[model samples]
Target: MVINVSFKVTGGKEFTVAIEPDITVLDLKKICAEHVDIPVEAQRIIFKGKILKDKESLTLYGVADGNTMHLVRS
Candidate 1:
């Protein structure tokens, strides 16, 4: 199944990426870079107050559909 995850920036600009449970954080960042201004290396996705690791998949992080992940640019 596809999960529609929302990444919220500080200024209220939100970017949405559709991903599967096995999609890694790095993969997500790559997709984000294509459609968003932030580069893959600069993206830090935070969920439940924890920073997501590049090698970890969405399922590993327990990321659910319709969940909001905060985006911090390094």
Candidate 2:
């Protein structure tokens, strides 16, 4: 289970969040908002070049084991 992870925002921001394997991507966004309340809905997350879905799972996209999530605000 991936507990804590460091998230890299493409706009030059690095943030961390607490997570588990079964949580939804939307949950990740909400957790991230607790860290830094940026544009939640407009933010995009990429896991190793794989686009993640808000309705999807974090671990399902291979985001565990030191894998990073790239956030891009459009």
Candidate 3:
């Protein structure tokens, strides 16, 4: 299944990215890293009030369709 996520950038910029339901948060990070001005090393993915590690698998994060990822300054 396809999953959709909405992200809020640090400067109030907002955008959405589509991914497979099985895609990891880290994978999502890579996409953001490519699309946003933030460096890959400086990017942080947070969900449900916890910071997500790049090495952490997405299935463990319980990511699903229509999830919202909030982006903040590092």
Candidate 4:
């Protein structure tokens, strides 16, 4: 099922990134890269209290509609 997730970047505003249940964090990064000005290499996605793994399933974080995810930028 498709869900909408809230993504927040460091020093930036929160935004929405709609995704499917099966997409990986890496894929999410690609989508985030388009939404946020930061480069993909500079993004480190965090959900709940843990760092999101690039190869893992995005659904693991319980990212439902309006679930906010924090992104660390360097």
Candidate 3 residue 58 Cα shift, in angstroms, is 1.7
Q: For residues 1-74, could you state the per-residue lDDT of candidate 4 as single tens digits?
A: 68888877787688886789679998999998998898888899988898898898877766777688888885
lDDT tens digits by residue: candidate 1, 1-74: 79888888756788887888698889988887887788889988888989889998878878888899888788
Where is model 4 more than 4 Å wrong at Cα? none
User: Each candidate's lDDT (Cα)?
Assistant: 0.84, 0.74, 0.78, 0.83
Q: Candidate 3: how large is its RMSD?
A: 1.4
Q: Rank by TM-score, highest first.
A: 1, 4, 3, 2
- Report backbone clashes per prediction: 0, 0, 0, 0
Put the candidates in lDDT order, highest first: 1, 4, 3, 2
Clashes of 1: 0
TM-score of every candidate? 0.89, 0.78, 0.85, 0.86
Clashes (candidate 4): 0
Q: For model 3, what is the alpha-carbon lDDT of residue 50?
A: 89
Q: Give the distance in Å from residue 44's predicted Cα in candidate 1 to where it truly belongs.
A: 0.8
1-74: candidate 3 lDDT, tens digit per residue: 66788888888788888877566666778889877888777888778898887776677878877888787758
Give me the displacement of residue 68 in model 2, in angstroms: 1.5
Off by over 4 Å in 1: none
